[PDB]
Design a protein around this ligand. Sequence first.
Ligand code: BR
Ligand code: BR
Ligand code: BR
Ligand code: BR
Ligand code: BR
Ligand code: BR
Lengths: 188, 180
Amino acid sequence: SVLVLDDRTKDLYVNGFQEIQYQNPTPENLQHMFHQGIEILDSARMINVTHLALWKPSSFKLGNPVDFALDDNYDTFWQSDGGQPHQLDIMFSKRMDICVMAIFFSMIADESYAPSLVKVYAGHSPSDARFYKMLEVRNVNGWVALRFLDNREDDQLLKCQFIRLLFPVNHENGKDTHLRGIRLYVPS
Amino acid sequence: SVLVLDDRIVDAATKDLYVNGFQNPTPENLQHMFHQGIEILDSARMINVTHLALWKPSSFKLGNPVDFALDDNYDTFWQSDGGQPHQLDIMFSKRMDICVMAIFFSMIADESYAPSLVKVYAGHSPSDARFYKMLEVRNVNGWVALRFLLKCQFIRLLFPVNHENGKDTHLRGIRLYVPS
Ligand SMILES: [Br-]
Ligand SMILES: [Br-]
Ligand SMILES: [Br-]
Ligand SMILES: [Br-]
Ligand SMILES: [Br-]
Ligand SMILES: [Br-]
């Protein structure tokens, strides 16, 4: 029900080496892992369904739309603009068999905009979504892949049409949050 | 027993083989990759036993000794000076548990001095050494971390051929590690 994320579980971190690669990541190292992570995920068999869903942010600062978390750029990010918790709604036109939800987290690059807790909800609709997991982002710099190995009933998959992400608190007294990249995949 | 090294083929399965990631980079970039790969490797759960072994090359040009492949410096390199195959013998005072052998390859920087095939042997000594792996350096610019761990006291690398009609070979960096 709760996943502690502290890259200092293996398959969870798309980046890293054998574990953290850089004890003190630089803008260059961060950008590198971002881009490498995208290459690695896309090399997998699964299909990228990210841009097939409708993405609705609770709020956003003008010039930092939600599309900036869906592109393939390390330098761009969606930035909320409101009170907490911030929210992100994902709605597909039909039910989906999500095998992987990947999220780029960087406490070094985002500082106060880096979320420290993330709550994931999925279902048929907002009035139906059910709590799935709590991500405790304690120390992370890179791509994390959620495989839903839980509930082997649906056999490692997140069958849903709607997904909700809640951001109730950030690192370092941050009010608003940043999201540079997130991706959703289905099998085959 | 044949490892085809090509850092252009993205594959989750080989991400830890290519220390500097998947793929002309400038000399500054190459330089950065070299020192970054060293930081990545040293910051790992491993013990660097490189300088504990005795290193003996089949030949070397004066001014480009074997020490230049073990100095953690990108601009320096061991350079052979003889007919092929070139050879590098590594001998420890005792049986080691090598979990990783890291080698820096750069076809861009080394051009004709870049090996296209490397044959790796290991054992107790030159007399009992056994063939372990054939490295096919097809396209590499960065550090390669070979996981084979492998308990041996003696390691031998043979360089039978280089890219682009090259007679002699360059090695800017190589390091050995045992589990922590
Ligand atoms: Br990486
Ligand atoms: Br906008
Ligand atoms: Br559903
Ligand atoms: Br010399
Ligand atoms: Br010759
Ligand atoms: Br032995």
